Structure formats: structure tokens, C-alpha cells
Write a protein that binds this DNA or RNA. Structure first.
Ligand SMILES: [Mg+2]
Ligand SMILES: [Mg+2]
Ligand SMILES: [Mg+2]
Ligand SMILES: [Mg+2]
Ligand SMILES: [Mg+2]
Ligand SMILES: [Mg+2]
Ligand SMILES: [Mg+2]
Ligand SMILES: [Mg+2]
Ligand SMILES: [Mg+2]
Ligand SMILES: [Mg+2]
Ligand SMILES: [Mg+2]
Ligand code: NA
Ligand code: NA
Lengths: 96, 169, 178, 148, 221
RNA sequence: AUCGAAUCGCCACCUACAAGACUGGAGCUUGCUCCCUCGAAGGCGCCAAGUAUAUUCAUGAUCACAAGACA
RNA sequence: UAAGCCCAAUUAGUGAUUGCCCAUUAUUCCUUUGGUAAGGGCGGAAACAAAUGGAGAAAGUGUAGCCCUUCCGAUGUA
RNA sequence: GGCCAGAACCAGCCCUACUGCAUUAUCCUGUCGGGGAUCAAAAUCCGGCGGGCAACGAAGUGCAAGAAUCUUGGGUCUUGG
């Protein structure tokens, strides 16, 4: 395997044309750590402080003919502990 | 009874670029292929269709195999098969699917309030009827315990506990 | 699906020389995937019949013969193939199709499945449309009935590709995983 | 012909026109519907305010990549939109709910004209209810196949 | 399985309500064994929690004798020097399906065992699954779309009963009682079902007229 | 009680059954015609408890794990 | 109703000639290194204190390579 | 701020959209005769003659050079600003 690129399957996206609609969308993987560490708006919004963490990526291209998508994460690679776990595919950047 | 594949049989295209269009069998090549044509549809000129891609309908026009284009048009108009087909529920559903596919966000909102409004009024009607003849879980259970509760609550001891603790409120 | 072989007409001759200043011109009928295969089949025919090599000849035309209008017809395909065990085997077969190319393409598939014959071991002698009254095989003649009707049974109808689902509720059409 | 250094330069897509009803995709008011009022100069962010009475969305600037601009629109020629300037959204620098009176007055005036504009527009009652509805991604939804 | 006292104490301190994970329940009756296993194995690797019922009604192509001999050839494979810790041949139809799924997973990795441990198999439909929700099927693994109906096929329970499975009669008796109980319950609640049907039909005359036209446009009236 | 977490569709209408060589019901002519509920939707849920007379939302300042989640 | 064999296609009698997946290969971009390497610059142009544009510029095989541009090759037991 | 992130624009690449020229005739039509099968026809089929563009997105046939500026496509966390 080459871990710099990840494969994400999205519900109701089962065609290559369906997967092309999501090219460029921002992708987020949400997990939690053991301790509360720094986050966005740590001082602005103290309610956001949590063990919850997110890794952010983007859809680069479709994969195959069945709506599979290729996702590249920001800088690093997604952990292998995320295999089989939930991936969030947002609707921005919007093209509509 | 299933509708046979025969000359003059009306079919609906299942998949492909002509999906959900109606044509007439006109001729049978072999066990796998036919020659569909529909004069009233622009994209439905005479062409070959695989029998796995057609759905026979309950209407058959009276044409011979390899009938002329004029003869098919006259038979299609005289039999009124297209007019009859358009009044069925499945034909309406196909039109409904096309309307939803090209719908906008505003029309999707309009359908949402239309279905919610019907849902609200169905509950109003159901609850009014459930009051007369109990059919739900709460109204049937309430009826099942009214007779026992009335018998037990009508005792002198129960009535003393009625007022002595209601007055505290 | 459209036929995988096209009807080609190749016209060619031996290149003129001192010995043969006015060479004969030959017209060739062949069903090939492309015109390069059509030209290859033409020079093979020229070599084994007229003793003329491609290096000593030229092609006058390699056009495609257009199909007629699509009508359900009976096609009589005269075809032959080579096997090591039995040499050359020539047969005459009847097919139901809408074009000459479709009938010949269906003939190649038939020979490939019932006799394991590939394209380059097969020669098509002739193909023609014949009337219903000259059809001998009952498997073909059964399609000439004036009132031919049959139901569609044991049919696997797949959903549209966009609407296909993995898990569906048992007696409904609601997709659970799709 | 419009110079890039000029403040009127814009590469905004035609769907994000003033008056278009947009779905807010990100931020505090995600899932709400708002009306696009204008685009700030120098190809700046859009300014949207779905009437704060209808959905609670105030006069706020938003990047055009974080909205879905729907085809259903509202006539905004009657709404001024002139006093919505970039300097309205700036803040003084600090060192080491509350709404300014100028901001509150701007919201009250803009929303009054915006609400009036919606009423005149045919199917104005439906569009007012449309501006109240919350957009959510449901199980089984396929927004990639939808038309907006 | 049985919750610990610490786990119960923590839940009461948290004050949470009853929790059920999102579980897909598949009715495996008249499903091709291999095609159902391949589809389920991929879904397990994608993080789905799957429970399969009526495993005794799975189907394999071919005559029962041919598939019985196939199992008996598998049964004869055992470590000669020590049959313990040898291949363990499970006779129950639910364990046969589980073994089929296991061979379609990377069973010797932690990720593969996480997928395998997310699958629960049953013979028939046990009471804890009856009322959990509607059952699903796998359209691409169903017998009537996969086999040509002329070819003989075997039912997994019939094959398993003659190679060592001892609970064929117990499952049949339990399944008979379940269907009678479900039929009696479904024979009841008919009045409730028709009451809501008339409420939806009568509600058309009470809603605003323009809302009815919208319903008719999208084929809901 | 540490404990901050990842999870994001509810139901007391699906949560009963069986068959795809034929399961809405008839006729005789056995593949056509006729009747019907017309044979291609489990119901809800998506921001006024319902389609209207309405009503707090900001400064959480342009994305950031939804800053919240007993529907 | 193969996930078997023979043949034949690329979303299919619709409207034309690239379905998809994997390399230390190909193309291209960045960096290194070595050339049978290919070229430019090297007579300080002029002006300019701090408190509040900068620095360098070696006639050179090889260095922290005088600097810059360009092209090609790069695995390997004895 | 030499940190993180998002949007803008540039230059360069990489992608996709929008297509013209040529060619059909063993072809397209009408009509006459034959032949065919029908309750009777028609059609599949073969000849004679007369017309011709099968032109709907005609053909899945040879070659296509269509400035993504017009008419604001996409990517570049695969480059540098
Ligand atoms: Mg079947
Ligand atoms: Mg180099
Ligand atoms: Mg000087
Ligand atoms: Mg030196
Ligand atoms: Mg070396
Ligand atoms: Mg003639
Ligand atoms: Mg002529
Ligand atoms: Mg094509
Ligand atoms: Mg162009
Ligand atoms: Mg660019
Ligand atoms: Mg860049
Ligand atoms: Na060098
Ligand atoms: Na004649």
C-alpha cells in the first residue's frame, strides 16, 4: 500500500459520475485522544476544549466506477486506526 | 397473466438512454431481440432492443410483423393505447420520478410541507376516530382499565383519599 | 449491441510491370474489425489464389459496405474453418439477424463456441438474405409464425446503475445500504 | 475591460447573484437559508442576511464557497444595500448580546426592506416559509444528483 | 456478555438510557451461500454491524448428496498426530456461514477479527431479534435471481442435519411457533393498519387544496 | 465519580408469511379480453403540532469535531 | 441467470472511435551527483553614515563547491 | 510572527466540455412482374423500369487542426508567486 492516498466510500455515491461531484470537497476524520489538547478557538470558545480531534483532507479524484473516492489528508497520512471508521465529507468548497 | 412478447405489444424500456420510454414491438428477430418503434416519441424511431431491456405492457395494437410506419401510426392512434397507458398508476409514477429528478430546492420544500400537512391531518382524523372506537395502544389500554379503575376507585376508602390529598394542592 | 465486424470491400491488383502492364483488378468481400485487418485478409487471399504479394501490389479502395435498413431476416451464411484434426470444414448455417454484418458476427461467435474456431482460421464464403420458405432448420423457421408470442420467464431484471443497492428491506424497495 | 486592481473586479459565479436564496453550509448558521444582498468590493466575501426574524441570521459576510446558491430568487432592487460597506464589518484593535447602535440600525433598516420585498414577490408566503426551513443531510440523501 | 456491576454502576451514574448500536439484520432464507458471504464480508470490513438469521435456509447449488460429500471431505481433514487443536468442523448452519465469511476475511489480523466479531449468526429468528426492525435481503445473492430454477439445489439445514447437526428439529419447532405468533399478531393490528389508511385517505379532503396539487405532481395522491 | 470523549434516523403503520414457470380478481379463446384498489413507493421525520395572522436569534465578527445530541 | 470454457465489447442499433486497478517503466515537476559536459559574468556602472533594502562577486580540477543559466547519465559481484 | 488554516487572484502545467471535412449505391424509395404465406392480406425474397440525401444528433466510416478569450469549467497539500 501507499499511505499518502486514502480510499473513502460515501453512502449513496455508487457511480464515478457521482464521485466526480465531490472532487475538491473538504474531508474530516473525527476521533478522540486521551487528554485535552489545543484546538481552534481554545481561548475564544472555551466550550470547544475537548479530547475530540479532527484530521482534515480533500477529495482528489474518483476511484473506479463505483463511487469510490481518493482523499489526500493535510500534510500527514490518515492513521490506519481510522480504517473502517466514519469519514465526514462536507459540501464545501461549493461549486453551486 | 403475464403479457406475451408479440407483434403490436407495447413495452417500456428498462435501462439505457431510452429508459422509461414506450414503444411497439413491430417485429421479433429471435429469442433475444425485437424491433421497437413509437411514432409519437421523437427518440423512438425503429431500432433493435434486447428483450432483457423491455417490459411488456397490457396493451397490444393490431399490426402485422414488419408493418409499415403509416400502419403502425394509424393502429396506435385508433387503439388509444397511449391514452389508456397514461391514465395508469405506473405511468403517473414514471412522470413523478422525472419531476422529482429535475426538482429544485424550493420545489423540494413545497413537497415537504405538502407531505407534512397531510401527515398532520391524518393524525387529526385518526385521533378523532380513535376517541370513538379505540384502536391505538393507549386508547385500547385505557378502555381495558376504565372498568376496573371505576370499580376500585368507587370504594369509600378511595373517596376519602381523593379529597384529603387533592385539597393539599 | 452493434456487430463487432464490418463489411469491407477491398479492390486491388498486382502492380503493373513490363511483364504485366495491364494487371487484373480484383474485388474482395470480407468482414473484419477494421480496414487494416481487411487489407491483411485481402492480400492473404491474393497470395494464396492469384500468387500476388502485397509488396508487389496496390490497393485501389478499402471502403465499408453499408448495412441496409434493419429488418428481421433469415441469413444464410456459407462459412468454413480449419482444424488440425479434420483439415477444412465447410458448413452452411441459417441465422436470424437485422444485417449482414450482424449475421456474420453472430456466425463467428457460433463457430467460436460450438467448434472452438478463432477468427483467423475462418473463411466466410458467402452471406445472403433468404426467404422464409427456403429455411430448412426448424430452430430458425419457428420465428416465421404469423402469430408468434411468448412470455418472458426466468428473467433477471437489474436496477438502474444509479439506483442499485446492496441491502434492501425484505418486502419493500427501501435501500438500507446503497 | 475591468482592471483587476480596481475594486469593482469580480470573478463571482453567476448563481451567487443578489437576491438569490442560499443554503449556508458552514459556520454558526449552517443549514439556514439566507438572502444574498451583495458582494463586497475587491472580489470580497458575499454579504447575506436572511431576515433575522425568519431564521436568526443577521447581516453577515460569508465566503461564496460556503453557500449553495439556489435558483429561487427574490427581487432586491427595492432594498438599498448601499450602506452595507466593508468598514461596517471592521473592528478596532484590542490590547491586553452586545450589538453596536449603528449595526443594529443597519440591520433594522435592511431587514424591513428585505421583508417587504419578499411579501410583494409572488408566492411570498411560501418563500417566507422557505427561508425558515432548515437544510439537513438525511440518511439516503444524494445531493450530488440534485438540482438547486 | 453479561454486564459487570461496575458497568451498570457507571451507567446509572451517567443516567443514560437504553442503547442499541446500528445493526443490520439480514434474512438469509433462499440466499446463495457464497454470494451472501462475499457481500457480508466486505460490509463487515467497512465497519458494519450485521446479524444474520435463518441460516438453515441458505442455499448451495447442486444436489444435496454432492454437497454432503463436499462437507464429508472437509470433515476427514484433521491433524493426525493430535485431532485436538486440529481443524474444528462445525455442523450448525449458522457456524457454516460464519466459517464461510471467516475464510473471506483477513482472519489473522486484528482488523480482520474486528470484522468477524461484528457478525452474529442465528438459526431461525430468535426472540431478541424479532422486534428489532425490518429485515433486509441481498438482491444480488438471492436464489431466484442467481440459480436457473431447473438446476437442483440444497438447503443448508437439510445438508447439515445429516453430517452432525443435532438441532434441526428444535429450530423447526421454534420457527413454527414464531410464525404462528407473528401471524396472530399480524392478524391483529389489522384494524390499526386500516385505520391509518383511511386517515391518510380522508386527510386529503382536509388539507389545503394547493398542498394536494403538489402531492399529485410528485405522485403521492 | 474520575469521564472530556469517536458514533449523528425515529416508530406501538416495516419490525408476519410465501412465490418469481407467473400471488389483485374473473372469463374462455390459454393469450387475449374484462372488472378493480389499474398491479413501480412501510409510515413518519428535515424548524409555527402546521401552511397562516405570526415570532428570540447578531459581537460565536468569513472554514475549523455540531460551541450540541433523550427526536 | 458462473466467480467455468470459446468469442466479443466499454456504458451500448443513441447519435462515432481512452470502463477501471496496480511498477524502482514512460511523460512531466523538484532536489542531488558526475560529465568527452555546453554557455554567460568576473576593468567593482553611478549613488547611498549611525541613532532607524541587506549581503556577496575567488580567472576557478577537487572545499561551505567564485556566481548564474542549460543539457545528458546515475543499479551492479570479481 | 519564520506558526496553523480558509478564500481570492497571477504565471506554468495537467484535466475534462463545445466539431468540421470527406465518404455511402451490395443503399433509399415508388411502380410493374414473379414468388410467398394467409380466411384474405401484408412482409421476408428475386427481377424490370423511374426517381433519389435513410441526412432525426443519418451512419457507431476515414481524417479532424474545434485559442476554457469570447461564452468567468476543474485541479495544483502534484509547481512557483
Ligand atoms: Mg427465477
Ligand atoms: Mg542532473
Ligand atoms: Mg561604485
Ligand atoms: Mg580550485
Ligand atoms: Mg555505481
Ligand atoms: Mg423493385
Ligand atoms: Mg438509378
Ligand atoms: Mg457510443
Ligand atoms: Mg474552443
Ligand atoms: Mg491556473
Ligand atoms: Mg501553489
Ligand atoms: Na553540475
Ligand atoms: Na408485388
Amino acid at each position: 500500500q501507499t499511505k499518502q492516498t486514502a480510499l473513502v466510500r460515501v453512502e449513496n455515491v455508487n457511480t464515478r459520475e457521482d464521485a466526480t461531484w465531490y472532487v475538491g470537497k473538504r474531508v474530516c476524520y473525527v476521533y478522540h485522544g486521551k487528554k485535552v489538547k489545543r484546538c481552534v478557538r481554545w481561548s475564544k470558545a472555551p466550550a470547544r476544549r475537548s479530547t475530540t480531534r479532527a484530521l482534515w483532507g480533500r477529495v482528489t479524484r474518483p476511484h473506479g466506477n463505483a463511487g469510490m473516492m481518493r482523499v489526500k489528508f493535510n500534510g500527514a497520512s490518515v492513521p490506519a486506526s481510522a480504517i473502517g471508521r466514519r469519514i465526514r465529507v462536507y459540501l464545501y468548497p461549493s461549486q453551486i | 397473466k403475464s403479457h406475451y412478447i408479440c407483434a403490436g405489444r407495447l413495452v417500456r424500456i428498462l435501462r439505457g438512454p431510452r429508459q422509461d420510454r414506450v414503444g411497439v414491438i413491430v417485429d421479433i428477430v429471435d429469442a433475444n431481440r425485437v424491433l421497437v418503434e413509437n411514432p409519437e416519441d421523437a427518440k423512438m424511431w425503429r431500432h433493435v432492443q434486447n428483450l432483457k431491456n423491455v417490459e411488456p405492457l397490457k396493451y397490444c395494437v393490431s399490426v402485422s410483423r414488419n408493418c409499415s410506419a403509416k400502419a403502425l401510426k394509424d393502429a396506435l392512434a385508433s387503439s388509444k393505447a397511449l391514452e389508456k397507458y397514461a391514465k395508469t398508476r405506473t405511468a403517473a409514477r414514471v412522470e413523478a420520478k422525472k419531476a422529482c429528478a429535475v426538482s429544485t430546492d424550493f420545489e423540494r420544500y413545497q413537497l415537504r410541507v405538502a407531505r407534512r400537512s397531510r401527515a398532520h391531518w391524518a393524525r387529526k382524523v385518526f385521533d378523532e376516530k380513535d376517541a370513538k372506537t379505540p384502536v391505538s395502544w393507549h386508547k385500547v389500554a385505557l378502555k381495558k382499565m376504565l372498568k376496573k379503575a371505576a370499580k376500585m376507585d368507587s370504594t369509600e376508602g378511595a373517596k376519602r383519599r381523593m379529597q384529603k390529598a387533592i385539597a393539599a394542592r | 449491441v452493434k456487430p463487432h465486424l464490418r463489411h469491407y470491400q477491398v479492390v486491388g491488383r498486382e502492380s503493373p510491370s513490363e511483364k504485366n502492364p495491364e494487371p487484373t483488378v480484383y474485388k474482395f468481400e470480407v468482414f473484419a474489425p477494421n480496414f487494416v485487418v481487411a487489407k491483411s485478409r485481402f492480400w492473404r487471399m491474393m497470395r494464396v489464389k492469384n500468387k500476388v504479394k502485397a509488396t508487389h501490389g496496390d490497393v485501389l479502395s478499402c471502403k465499408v459496405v453499408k448495412d441496409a435498413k434493419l429488418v428481421a431476416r433469415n441469413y444464410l451464411v456459407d462459412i468454413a474453418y480449419y482444424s488440425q484434426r479434420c483439415g477444412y470444414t465447410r458448413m452452411v448455417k441459417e441465422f436470424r439477424d437485422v444485417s449482414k454484418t450482424g449475421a456474420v458476427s453472430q456466425a463467428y461467435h457460433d463457430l467460436a463456441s460450438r467448434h472452438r474456431a478463432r477468427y483467423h482460421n475462418i473463411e466466410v464464403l458467402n452471406v445472403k438474405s433468404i426467404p422464409d420458405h427456403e429455411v430448412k432448420h426448424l430452430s430458425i423457421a419457428q420465428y416465421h409464425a404469423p402469430n408468434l408470442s411468448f412470455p418472458l420467464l426466468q428473467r433477471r431484471t437489474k436496477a438502474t446503475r444509479k439506483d442499485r443497492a446492496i441491502f434492501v428491506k425484505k418486502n419493500t424497495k427501501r435501500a438500507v445500504v446503497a | 475591460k475591468v482592471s483587476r486592481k480596481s475594486p469593482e473586479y469580480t470573478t463571482l459565479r453567476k448563481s451567487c447573484a443578489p437576491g438569490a436564496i442560499a443554503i449556508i453550509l458552514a459556520g454558526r448558521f449552517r443549514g439556514r437559508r439566507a438572502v444574498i444582498l451583495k458582494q463586497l468590493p475587491h472580489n470580497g466575501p458575499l454579504v447575506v442576511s436572511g431576515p433575522m426574524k425568519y431564521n436568526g441570521v443577521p447581516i453577515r459576510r460569508i465566503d461564496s464557497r460556503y453557500v449553495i446558491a439556489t435558483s429561487t430568487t427574490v427581487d432586491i432592487s427595492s432594498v438599498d444595500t448601499a450602506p452595507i460597506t466593508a468598514e461596517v464589518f471592521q473592528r478596532p484593535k484590542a490590547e491586553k448580546t452586545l450589538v453596536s447602535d449603528a449595526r443594529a440600525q443597519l440591520q433594522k433598516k435592511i431587514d424591513a426592506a428585505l421583508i417587504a420585498a419578499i411579501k410583494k414577490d409572488a408566492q411570498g408566503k411560501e418563500k417566507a416559509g422557505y427561508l425558515r426551513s432548515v437544510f439537513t443531510v438525511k440518511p439516503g440523501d444524494a445531493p450530488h444528483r440534485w438540482n438547486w | 456478555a453479561f454486564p459487570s456491576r461496575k458497568d451498570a454502576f457507571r451507567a446509572q451514574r451517567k443516567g443514560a438510557k437504553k442503547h442499541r448500536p446500528e445493526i443490520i439484520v439480514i434474512d438469509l432464507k433462499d440466499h446463495v451461500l457464497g454470494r451472501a458471504a462475499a457481500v457480508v464480508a466486505k460490509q463487515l470490513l467497512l465497519g458494519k454491524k450485521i446479524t444474520v438469521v435463518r441460516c438453515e435456509q441458505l442455499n448451495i447449488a447442486g444436489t444435496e448428496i454432492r454437497n454432503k460429500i463436499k462437507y464429508l471431505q472437509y470433515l476427514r481433514k484433521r491433524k493426525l498426530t493430535n485431532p485436538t487443536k486440529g481443524p474444528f468442523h462445525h455442523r450448525a448452519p449458522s457456524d457454516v456461514f460464519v466459517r464461510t465469511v471467516r475464510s473471506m476475511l483477513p482472519r489473522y489480523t486484528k482488523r480482520g477479527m474486528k470484522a468477524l466479531n461484528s457478525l452474529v449468526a442465528y438459526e431461525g429468528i430468535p426472540p431478541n431479534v424479532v422486534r428489532t426492525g425490518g429485515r433486509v435481503v441481498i438482491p444480488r445473492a438471492q436464489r431466484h435471481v442467481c440459480y436457473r430454477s431447473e438446476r437442483p439445489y440444497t438447503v443448508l439445514g437439510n445438508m447439515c442435519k445429516h453430517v452432525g447437526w443435532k438441532y434441526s428439529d428444535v429450530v423447526a419447532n421454534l420457527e413454527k411457533a414464531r410464525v404462528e405468533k407473528a401471524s396472530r399478531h399480524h392478524e391483529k393490528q389489522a384494524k390499526l393498519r386500516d385505520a391509518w389508511k383511511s386517515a391518510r385517505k380522508e386527510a386529503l379532503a382536509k388539507m389545503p387544496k394547493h398542498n394536494v396539487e403538489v402531492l399529485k405532481k410528485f405522485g403521492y395522491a
